[PDB]
Amino acid sequence: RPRFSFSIAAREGKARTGTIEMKRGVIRTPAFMPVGTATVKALKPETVRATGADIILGNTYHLMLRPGAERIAKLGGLHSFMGWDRPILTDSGGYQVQSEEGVTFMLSPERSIEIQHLLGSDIVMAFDECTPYPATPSRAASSMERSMRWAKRSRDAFDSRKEQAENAALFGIQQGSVFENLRQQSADALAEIGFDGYAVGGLAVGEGQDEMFRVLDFSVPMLPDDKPHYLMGVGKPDDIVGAVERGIDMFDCVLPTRSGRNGQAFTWDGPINIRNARFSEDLKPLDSECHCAVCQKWSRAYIHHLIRAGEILGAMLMTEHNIAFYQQLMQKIRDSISEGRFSQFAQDFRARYF
Amino acid sequence: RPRFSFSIAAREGKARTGTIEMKRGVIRTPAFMPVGTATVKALKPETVRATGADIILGNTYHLMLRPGAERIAKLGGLHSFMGWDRPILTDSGGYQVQSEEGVTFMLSPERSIEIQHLLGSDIVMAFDECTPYPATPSRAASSMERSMRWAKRSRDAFDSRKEQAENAALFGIQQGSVFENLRQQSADALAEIGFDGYAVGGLAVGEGQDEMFRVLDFSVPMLPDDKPHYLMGVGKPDDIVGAVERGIDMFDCVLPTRSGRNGQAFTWDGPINIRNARFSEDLKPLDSECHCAVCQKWSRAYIHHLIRAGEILGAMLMTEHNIAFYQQLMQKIRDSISEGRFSQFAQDFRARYF
C-alpha cells in the first residue's frame, strides 16, 4: 500500500465516497473516526474495529501529559501501546491547550509535529489556532494569518523528518471564522504550501448548524477537490449528513462516547436517554434495526439499570452501541452515494430521526 | 441433565475433584465462582465464560433493591436479563443486610427463598446469620441455633414451590464460630434436614488463616462427604489452596474484581500493584505464564497508565486477568488432584507465590 492515496469512487452533487489507502490500512470515506484516550473509552480495540471503524483519532494532548510522547515512543509507539494496528489520526494538541512561537501552558508547531511523530501517527495535523466565536473580522484575520504561518512551519517540520515524511500524511487546517474572504485566503495559502488532506477548522464552536452549513457552502469548494476534506469536531448525526452534502469526507466527535456514558443512545428515531423511567421494563434493544452486538444481546431495561447503577458495563454497552450506530450511519451514507440516492437518504433519515 | 448430581472423580487426602451436573450446565470442582452486580463488574458474560467460569454468584442483596426481584422475574429472570445462560448461585442476602422472624432493615428465610426463585437461581442458599467474630460460646450457640431453625424454614419454603424444587438446588450453611461442639451440632442439624450441598459459614470474618484452617480441619469432615462443600467468602489464592487441602469444593470472593480495579494483579510470583512506578515502562504482560487475552495483548506499562488515569479500560483489563488467573488456579488444582500430585502442587505454588 502507498503512504497516502485518496481515490473518489462515486459522487452525488458535492458528496463523495471513496477510499484513503495508507500503509496501515484502508479508510472508507465518508469516515467517522472514534476518539480515544484507550482507542475509545470503555472499549477494547477489537470492539472498536468490530463496529466498523477504519481509523481512530489519537488524543495527543492527554498523551503528551501522561504517559508522555517520549515514553510512548520508547515503548514502541501508540499503535503497539494501545493494540490498534490500523491508521491513527493525531490531533495537534492545540484545541485542548500565546505568542508567534506557539502556546505556553511550550507547544509550538515544531514540538506538536514532533510529538505526533513520537506517537507514530499516520495522519498528522498541522498546529493551528481554533479562532473563538464570535470573532471580529480583525481578530479572525490575525488568527488565520498566524495559523497559516504555523501551517508552513508544520509542513517544514514534517518534511525534515525522513521517517515521518515517508510513512505518514500531513493535513492543513483552514481558518477564517465565518468570513468568505478569509476562508479563501486561507484555502489559497494552504494549497500553496500543499498538504495531503485539508480540514475545515474554526466551526462547531458555538455558531449553530445554520451558520455552520452556510460557511461550509462556500468554504469546502475552496479546498482542492482531489484531496480529503475533514470537518473537525463534528458531530451530531444530522450535522454529519449535512456536511457530507457539502463535500466533507471525514469527521470526529466525542459525542457518541461522551453521550453514551451519559445515558444518551442514538437510534434511527432520534436519541433516547436510557435512564428515563420509561425504559425500566422495555425489553426491546436500544434500536430496532441496529446490527451491533449490544442490540443483539441486551435490552433497554438492562442497560437502563446498569447506567442508573453507575456500572462500568453500562458505559461499555452504551459506547459500543453508539460507535456502532455512527459507523452504520457512515455505511448508509457511503452506500447511498455509491448508488446515487444520497439526497433521498438524507431526506428519509431526517424525516424519521426528527 | 439432572436437577443436581455431584460426582467425585478423584481424591487426594481430603481434597476432591469432580463435577456438579445441573440443568443449565456442568460445574467443575473445585470451583471458583466470580461475583457480580453485571455477571462481574466490567465484564461481559462472554468474557466471564472465556476465563473459564462455569458458574457465577448472583448478588441478591443489590438486585432486590434495584431493579427489584419481581421486576427481574417479569423481565424473564436474571439469566435472561444479564445474558448468562449457565448456572447461577444466589446468596441469601443475609450477610450484606433482628428477630426470630428475620431481619428488618423484612428479610426472612421465606422471602429470601422467594427472591432467589424470582431471580431464577440454580443454586439457592438457605437464609442464615453469619456470627460475628469473636463470639462467646453463648452468642455463637444462640446464633447457630437460630440459623438452624432458619435452615429448616428455608428447606420448607423451597420445597413448597414446585418449580423451584424441581429445577434448582438448595444448600445449607454450617455455623458455630470456632467451636468444635457447635460446628458438630450444626452439621448434624443440617444433615437431618437434608440439603443438596453444604456451606461452611462463619469464617473469613476476622479470625485469620491459621484459625480458619484449624476450624476447617474439624468442621469439613462433619459434613456429608458425598455432597459439595462451599466455603463462603474465601478468598486469597493461598486460602483457596489450603481450603481444598481440607475438603472444600467451592469458593466465592470479590477479591479478584475489587483488587483488580484497585490496581492489584495476581501473578504466580505473588500479587503486584500495577500502579507502582516500577511498571511504567515494563513491556512484560501482567504474568509471564497466564493464558488470558489481556496477557496476550497488553503490557504492564499500558495497564499501569490506564489505572493511573482512572480509565474504564484499566478496570476491564485488570478484572479479566484476575478472574482468569483464579480460573487457571482452579484448573491447576483440579488437574493436580486428578493426577495425585496436589500435595506437591500446593508446595510448589506456595514456594513461588511467597
Ligand SMILES: O=c1[nH]cnc2c(CCNCC3CCCCC3)c3[nH]c(NCc4cccs4)nc3cc12
Ligand atoms: O479549528 C480547529 N482546529 C483544531 N482542532 C479543532 C477541534 C478539535 C477536533 N477534535 C479534537 C479531539 C482531540 C482528541 C481529544 C478530544 C477532542 C474542534 N472541535 C470543534 N468542535 C467541538 C465541539 C462540538 C460541540 C461543542 S464543542 N471545533 C473544532 C475546531 C478545531
Ligand SMILES: O=c1[nH]cnc2c(CCNCC3CCCCC3)c3[nH]c(NCc4cccs4)nc3cc12
Ligand atoms: O456465614 C456466612 N453466611 C452467609 N454468607 C457469608 C458470606 C458471604 C459470601 N459471599 C457474599 C457475596 C454476595 C454477593 C455480593 C458480594 C458478597 C461471607 N463472606 C465472608 N468473608 C468475606 C470477607 C473476606 C475478607 C474480608 S470480608 N464470610 C462469610 C460468611 C458468610
Ligand SMILES: [Zn+2]
Ligand atoms: Zn446497537
Ligand SMILES: [Zn+2]
Ligand atoms: Zn493474564
